[PDB]
Design a protein around this motif. Sequence first.
Motif, PDB file in Angstrom:
ATOM      1  N   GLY A  15       0.789  -1.221   0.000  1.00  0.00           N
ATOM      2  CA  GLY A  15       0.000   0.000   0.000  1.00  0.00           C
ATOM      3  C   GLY A  15       0.823   1.274   0.000  1.00  0.00           C
ATOM      4  N   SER A  17       4.493   3.508  -1.068  1.00  0.00           N
ATOM      5  CA  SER A  17       5.209   3.797  -2.300  1.00  0.00           C
ATOM      6  C   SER A  17       6.690   3.817  -1.966  1.00  0.00           C
ATOM      7  N   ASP A  66       0.375   2.178 -14.789  1.00  0.00           N
ATOM      8  CA  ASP A  66      -0.358   2.500 -13.569  1.00  0.00           C
ATOM      9  C   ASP A  66       0.426   2.215 -12.286  1.00  0.00           C
ATOM     10  N   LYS A  67       1.636   1.682 -12.431  1.00  0.00           N
ATOM     11  CA  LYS A  67       2.467   1.326 -11.285  1.00  0.00           C
ATOM     12  C   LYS A  67       3.725   2.165 -11.110  1.00  0.00           C
ATOM     13  N   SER A  84       4.124   2.881  -7.031  1.00  0.00           N
ATOM     14  CA  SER A  84       2.974   3.227  -6.193  1.00  0.00           C
ATOM     15  C   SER A  84       2.157   1.996  -5.800  1.00  0.00           C
ATOM     16  N   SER A  85       1.303   2.159  -4.791  1.00  0.00           N
ATOM     17  CA  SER A  85       0.426   1.088  -4.305  1.00  0.00           C
ATOM     18  C   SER A  85       1.094  -0.280  -4.335  1.00  0.00           C
ATOM     19  N   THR A  87       2.522  -4.007  -3.723  1.00  0.00           N
ATOM     20  CA  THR A  87       1.941  -5.305  -3.395  1.00  0.00           C
ATOM     21  C   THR A  87       3.111  -6.277  -3.419  1.00  0.00           C
TER      22      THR A  87
END
Lengths: 121, 13, 112
Positions: A15, A17, A66-67, A84-85, A87
């Motif tokens: 979650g 960065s 998107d990452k 980002s975000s 996982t």
Amino acid sequence: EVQLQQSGAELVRPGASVKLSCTASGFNIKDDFMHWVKQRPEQGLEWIGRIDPANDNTKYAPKFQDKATIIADTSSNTAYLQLSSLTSEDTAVYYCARRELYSYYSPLDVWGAGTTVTVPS
Amino acid sequence: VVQEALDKAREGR
Amino acid sequence: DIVMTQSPSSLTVTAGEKVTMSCKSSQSLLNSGNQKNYLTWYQQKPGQPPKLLIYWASTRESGVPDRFTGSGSGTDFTLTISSVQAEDLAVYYCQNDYSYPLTFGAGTKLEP
């Protein structure tokens, strides 16, 4: 003598960065496209994207659009990769590489030692 | 094409 | 997207052995504008980043030993090692450097 210096290992929570650095030494990055490549444990190489520090023109592989965010700071002669975000799937070694522009064409000839990002499950 | 991207970059295009 | 298929996936080698590895692209990597194949070969050892060996299918990067020869054109490429040396144990990857997104093959691992 030309080299790319990469930041230390990063242990990051899901979650969040993280921003990795790639500092060039021996040349100015304004004369090179700066690339980022991902490699999961025991897996192959995945191109993430690149940036032209001279005008900040970027190009990403669709799957990373998107990452990842690739940026450059000519003053500190450093290129960056922000994920980002996060996982657990982002757990991998991230390499930066350069493509010089003085040659009509040059491959990705210089690579950094890589930075390992670990995001627990 | 990659080469085209390199060419445009150096041409200011 | 250009898919790069390398074979064999692995190869058990001995010192002095001659070996060939194949790399096939799903689309031609030949730039009609300059008649050069945008295919690059890398060598990657454990805990190290990929190391450039050959670009434009057959041009050896300065410093790379002559035992490494790249050949092929269009969609069919080959990396040949005339005589394997212990320092050659590693994974060899080919890369589409023709169009975006840049893509890599799954590599051919030379094992003891």
